[PDB]
């Protein structure tokens, strides 16, 4: 269904029309932010200028712990060269005027042995 048809536009190669069937019943854009397009760009150059000089960090700790090693082997060398210079000398000194400590036995029982054949020269 029971129709009534409004006519709107008969045309070369088509038609249109409404078919109202039952009454109804009762009752900017902003160019602005390509600036926030620049906000992201911003907080990623930071995001990364983090992990960067944070990884430039995680190196030259590296370069540090390499050296805190060679730098700790040199400690073991010019610590224990003198465990040897003050031993192979606390030694050749401990003896070299200490075996000659054995010669004050000799130039003694010698300057006495001569000294009492000087007693025999005591029959003149």
């Amino acid at each position: 269904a029971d129709m009534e048809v409004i006519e709107l536009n008969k045309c070369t190669s088509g038609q249109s029309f409404e078919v109202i069937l039952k009454p109804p019943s009762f009752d900017p854009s902003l160019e602005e932010i390509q600036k926030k397009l620049e906000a992201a760009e911003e907080r990623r150059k930071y995001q990364e200028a983090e992990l960067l000089k944070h990884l430039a960090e995680k190196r030259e700790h590296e370069r540090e712990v390499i050296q805190k090693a060679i730098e700790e082997n040199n400690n073991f060398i010019k610590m224990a060269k003198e465990k040897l210079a003050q031993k192979m000398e606390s030694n050749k000194e401990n003896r070299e005027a200490h075996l000659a400590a054995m010669l004050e036995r000799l130039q003694e029982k010698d300057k006495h042995a001569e000294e009492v054949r000087k007693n025999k020269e005591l029959k003149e």
């Binding site: 990364e48 992990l51 712990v65 390499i66 050296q67 730098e71």
Partner: protein, 419 residues
């Protein structure tokens, strides 16, 4: 869109030699020569793993790194030994140590540059490089040590790009060496920070897999090495072939990891050794079948991905997958909506007219990590062989930073069993 590949040391190198011996096969490349394959597809994505060269010829994108000639001269001879650019070889000449410090710091740094210098020329000479993937032992020295570093060095010279690793997390069974716990604990801290996805290949799982189910009595470093090799195959695949998705691998990463904490995937395979499809799923989703020694049970899944291979209709694949998650409802997370994705590819592998491979981001992996953080404090306890690294120029508490970090990780895995 393009990816260069790093292999580092004894395990890292042998793993890859049998990785390239498979993909080179499926594409069809002689030891040196270019193509020979009655298929056609292949060469779509051959791009992604092959910077090609003189004549027709194909040379893989491969950086070979080790700190002792040894295992590298073991590849130049043998498999597709001829294939890699002989200038893509970096020998170490000195010791490895089997000690993480030598690898990451002293005997390591020493080389780094001359591999850094090569990844550069290869990557800086791709055309829209997508990322790096690298293989390595996770305990032990050169691989684990120099690796962790190399990737820590790669980041920075590449922020931007994504980091992919296959890591063989080492076990008490199959190789002793009072130390790995240390090397591993140290590296695990290290991965967690530098990479975007890592694949935990547990040797414990690997050899328990050749035994509890396979009856291979005295397992080679070979077979077992052959297992990873074929798991490497199917984990890539859509990376290297298809016409389905297209897989930025970043597209992977950004989809399989809800939490920045590069979560470590446990892999696993279809028909094992050296096939109905139902029977190919209940195998792939079975715990006796995972490349990481965990029973995904005590531990639910976050995200899962599975890629199937060969002549079979995605009719039963659709509904066999969209099945598993009902005859096991509460073992995939409630709050990540469509977190198990499947992909179909129809060009077969080694033998096999049918094969699934599986990638799971599961908190079951907490189990794998806890146990190494425990061989750890069972030594770092009474400050054990620590002296091998105190002496190398490392600090006492730089172990406590990585036990105190690895424990943090185990804790997130735990926390996430939520509302």
């Amino acid at each position: 869109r393009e990816i260069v590949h790093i292999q580092a040391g004894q395990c890292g190198n042998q793993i890859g030699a049998k990785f390239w011996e498979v993909i080179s096969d499926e594409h069809g490349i002689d030891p040196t020569g270019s193509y020979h394959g009655d298929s056609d597809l292949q060469l779509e994505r051959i791009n992604v793993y092959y910077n090609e060269a003189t004549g027709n010829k194909y040379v893989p994108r491969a950086i070979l790194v080790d700190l002792e000639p040894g295992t590298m001269d073991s590849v130049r001879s043998g498999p597709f030994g001829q294939i890699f650019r002989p200038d893509n070889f970096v020998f170490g000449q000195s010791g490895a140590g089997n000690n993480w410090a030598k690898g990451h710091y002293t005997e390591g740094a020493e080389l780094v540059d001359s591999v850094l210098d090569v990844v550069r020329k290869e990557s800086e000479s791709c055309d829209c490089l997508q990322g790096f993937q690298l293989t390595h032992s996770l305990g032990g020295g050169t691989g684990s040590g120099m690796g962790t570093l190399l990737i820590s060095k790669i980041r920075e010279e590449y922020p931007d790009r994504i980091m992919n690793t296959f890591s063989v997390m080492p076990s008490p069974k199959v190789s002793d060496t009072v130390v790995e716990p240390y090397n591993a604990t140290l590296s695990v801290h290290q991965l967690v920070e530098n990479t975007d996805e890592t694949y935990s290949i547990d040797n414990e799982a690997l050899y328990d897999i050749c035994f509890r189910t396979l009856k291979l009595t005295t397992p080679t470093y070979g077979d077992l090495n052959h297992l990873v090799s074929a798991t490497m195959s199917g984990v890539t695949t859509c990376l290297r072939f298809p016409g389905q998705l297209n897989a930025d691998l970043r597209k992977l990463a950004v989809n399989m990891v809800p939490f920045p904490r590069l979560h470590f995937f446990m892999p696993g395979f279809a028909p094992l050794t050296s096939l109905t499809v139902p029977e190919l799923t209940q195998q792939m989703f079975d715990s006796k079948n995972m490349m990481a020694a965990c029973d995904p049970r005590h531990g639910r899944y976050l995200t899962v991905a599975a890629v199937f291979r060969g002549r079979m209709s995605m009719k039963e694949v659709d509904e066999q997958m969209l099945n598993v998650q009902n005859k096991n409802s509460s073992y995939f997370v409630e709050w990540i909506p469509n977190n198990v994705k499947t992909a179909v590819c129809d060009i077969p592998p080694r033998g096999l007219k049918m094969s699934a491979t599986f990638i799971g981001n599961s908190t079951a992996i907490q189990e794998l990590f806890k146990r190494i953080s425990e061989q750890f404090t069972a030594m770092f306890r009474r400050k054990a062989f620590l002296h091998w690294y105190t002496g190398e120029g490392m600090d006492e508490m730089e172990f406590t930073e990585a036990e105190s970090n690895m424990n943090d990780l185990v804790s997130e895995y735990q926390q996430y069993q939520d509302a």
